[PDB]
Design a binder for these strands. Sequence first.
DNA 1: CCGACTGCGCATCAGC
DNA 2: GCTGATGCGC
DNA 3: GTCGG
Length: 326
Amino acid sequence: TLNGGITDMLTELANFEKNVSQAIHKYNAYRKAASVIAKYPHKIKSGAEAKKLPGVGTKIAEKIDEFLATGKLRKLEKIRQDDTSSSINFLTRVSGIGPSAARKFVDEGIKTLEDLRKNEDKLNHHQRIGLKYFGDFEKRIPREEMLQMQDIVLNEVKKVDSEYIATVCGSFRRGAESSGDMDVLLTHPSFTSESTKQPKLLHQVVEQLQKVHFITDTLSKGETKFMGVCQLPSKNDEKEYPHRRIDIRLIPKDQYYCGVLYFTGSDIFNKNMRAHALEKGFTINEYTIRPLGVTGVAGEPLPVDSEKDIFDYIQWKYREPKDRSE
DNA sequence: CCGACTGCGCATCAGC
DNA sequence: GCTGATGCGC
DNA sequence: GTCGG
Ligand SMILES: Nc1ncnc2c1ncn2[C@H]1C[C@H](O)[C@@H](COP(=O)(O)C(F)(F)P(=O)(O)OP(=O)(O)O)O1
Ligand SMILES: [Cl-]
Ligand SMILES: [Cl-]
Ligand SMILES: [Cl-]
Ligand SMILES: [Cl-]
Ligand SMILES: [Mg+2]
Ligand SMILES: [Mg+2]
Ligand code: NA
Ligand code: NA
């Protein structure tokens, strides 16, 4: 946090653009700039100096000059005082309420926590659960609890079928001392890019975790992705732990390396890495890396036997999980 | 100058 | 019902 | 909002 002030500013600007202006490219540009500045190993003394960094252009350099001179940004001060942007910004803090629904609710006079609570019937299932756990989903997860949750998830999975492999990814795999949620990558020999010889592979695991009261609510659920809410058991007399967000992704077993690469992140690291891939004539998703023909059509998946293999294809030196926190 | 900007699962909706 | 587009979040 | 060609 050499430049915590500046990165916060840009982050607030990204969120404004996404939530209020609904300008996805500006949102991503701001996030990119924040990221590159976050990792810059010097305390920035000027906008010119920041403008040397890829992703920081003229407009951002200017805002940086203002913030350095004043400790603030007029543009943001104004935004913070605009009732409508304020209302939309808060409303999108509820899981399931996006830029669109937020703006709608405001239109309809629903713009506070109290408003949402008395208008539950105007929420879809996801939003309803987001509202229910609005406070909990605010709280970070200490690594020590992530370890307990890991322990539970891995053992319960083993109980359904010893052939399942569950890997906790996200910031936890990057070594973070705290996490926003729990991301579980799941594989089983019966599900490969070649065939699905067992149905309900994801369901049985979800059901087991529900049976033991680890999973408490469901936000969405398909054949390969589950998104929901979980909770650690507390002891006699002990207050309860906050409810936590959990995501599970069932990935074909032979595409584990692309899968774990994807799910380890960070989200900006993936974006960067995928952009570079393109510039090298490849496209990467959570399943495969393929070449991009002259015509732009992606070709056949290339052989992959390690995360590193994927880095090699794009002429990047390998980066351990802990060094992918962008 | 200007096209392009990482990639995708699930929920919901519109048009047929 | 189906398919495609859009919303949301990973 | 930024950038590559
Ligand atoms: N927009 C994206 N593009 C590509 N990969 C993504 C994207 N968003 C997420 N992933 C990836 C890569 C991610 O690391 C992973 C989990 O997404 P989470 O939404 O749980 C996260 F990003 F917040 P995490 O890194 O885990 O940080 P905490 O959750 O706060 O602790 O899927
Ligand atoms: Cl935009
Ligand atoms: Cl400010
Ligand atoms: Cl793979
Ligand atoms: Cl693919
Ligand atoms: Mg996570
Ligand atoms: Mg997650
Ligand atoms: Na720059
Ligand atoms: Na939200």
